[PDB]
Every structure is written in structure tokens, then in C-alpha cells.
Amino acid sequence: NNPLKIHNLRPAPGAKTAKTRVGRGEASKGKTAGRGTKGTKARYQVPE
RNA sequence: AGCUGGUUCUCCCCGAAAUGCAUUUAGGUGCAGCGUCGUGUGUUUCUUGCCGGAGGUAGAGCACUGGAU
């Protein structure tokens, strides 16, 4: 009983993965946002 | 701008590198080394004992070459 209502929909577990917000706080992808310090790759992309 | 600075909430698990080659190359980067996660394998890793191997260092020596009372 109590049929499917639109507030009962949930995705299959593992379907949706929360984004990775780099640059917020130091207990996460911190100040460098996973880049290191002062290289060509600390500001730019190196072509393959 | 191969350059300088800045990049904001939390906790749980693991956790390095500053080495090799090459480089209009040396404070940069490519590959390899070292980290992590997923998947397959499952003791293959590592330590100690024993066994089979090649050597030319420490030491020693003058048989070769050289030095030398």
C-alpha cells in the first residue's frame, strides 16, 4: 500500500557520485588543489 | 609569463620524492623508480638456516711492471 510517490524516488546505490570540490579548506583538496608547488603544471597544462 | 603570489568546511584509511636516462637541457618537462584506488592472482614478497655458484675489495706478498737503502 502507499504507492510510489515522486518523493520516494532514489537512485540505484553507487549511481550518483558527489562532486570533488577542490580548493575549499585544508582538510580536503587543499590550497594547491592537488597540483604541488610552482611548476609548469602548477598553473598550466603540458601537452602529451 | 618554463616566473612570483593566492586558491575558502570537516573527519576516516593509506602514504611518498629530492634518484636514473634524455633534453636549446639544468629553478622546466617526457619516460623509468617510489604513492594510492579498482580488478585478477594467492604466499609467488620478505627474514633466517642449509646447499650450488662467479669474484679479486680489506688484508697480505714480490712470482710479473715499476719505485727503492
Side-chain angles (χ1 to χ4, degrees):
Chain A
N1 184 86
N2 314 67
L4 206 70
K5 265 302 181 83
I6 209 164
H7 69 88
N8 264 357
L9 311 189
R10 54 201 321 141
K16 295 333 181 53
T17 301
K19 214 160 157 76
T20 284
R21 285 231 312 291
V22 299
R24 323 302 182 181
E26 192 66 49
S28 168
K29 304 262 201 143
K31 84 186 196 318
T32 61
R35 299 197 107 168
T37 81
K38 64 178 73 175
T40 291
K41 294 142 81 53
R43 283 142 200 131
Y44 284 118
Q45 295 293 321
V46 169
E48 294 293 328

